[PDB]
Amino acid sequence: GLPLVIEGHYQVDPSLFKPNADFLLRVSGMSMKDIGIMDGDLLAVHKTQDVRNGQVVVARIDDEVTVKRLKKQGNKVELLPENSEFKPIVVDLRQQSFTIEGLAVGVIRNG
Amino acid sequence: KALTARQQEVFDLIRDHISQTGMPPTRAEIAQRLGFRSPNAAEEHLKALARKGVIEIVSGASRGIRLLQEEEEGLPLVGRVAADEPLLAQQHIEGHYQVDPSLFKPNADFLLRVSGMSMKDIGIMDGDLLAVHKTQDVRNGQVVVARIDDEVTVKRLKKQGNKVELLPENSEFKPIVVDLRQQSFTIEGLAVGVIRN
Q1: Coiled-coil regions in this chain (chain B)?
Q2: Which of A78, B30, B63, B77 is deepest in the core (most CB within 10 A)?
Q3: Chain A positions in Cβ-Cβ contact with residue B105 (cut-off 8 Å)
């Protein structure tokens, strides 16, 4: 049982993912298509703030959520795509609010 | 109820025979394949399986064995497939996942581990678990699960007369051309979704 964020609920064993999934999120756009995360996919997410460079994360940049690969160095935070047509996003912790919502641990596609 | 090691082997053979021919094995075939001393020996194990409710034995015509309690919750996962064995042979099943089959349309019957990056342009990656609806009724342009001389593959269908072309979704790959006049070919099912973990 996994909730979609509550907008819906799906009967998919949370323990099929490691770490375990806490919720699902609907993906918008093709910024992460090169690693198989497509528009309309449901992303399985483990709620946590402890992540590292190279992992795919869910971040909130001042009221907006995005799914990208992390590359952080101190106060400099880069959120990178997996699509050559997209620009990387750069954030400065000293100016705008930045929060890690979780770690991507899986995907469910049932269009 | 628990099946002994030998009872499990007899039950597995019965299920594999039905999956490959849709017909159960004879008592003689069971004794021969499992090296029993005689058909009487096979009958004893069959009596125990019926007693445990996994099968029904009907007196009369030959090959009178029927499976019971077939409906299962969730989906079985199929791994690497061996030559001369049906797709759902017991030796291919790695486990059972508790996933709602109705999340997919048409409904899923099983999951299949994907090998390689041939379909990465549409988001199907090496290691993904493909949700499959078992059927032989497919159409040009759909993504299907097929078997060429027993090798299983996931590609887009393009019928070509006495030949069949199976198309990839990756620039590094080229189509697989099957000549029906000299190669065995079968459609196993339709791809209806993906679970990546």
Answers
A1: none
A2: B30
A3: 110
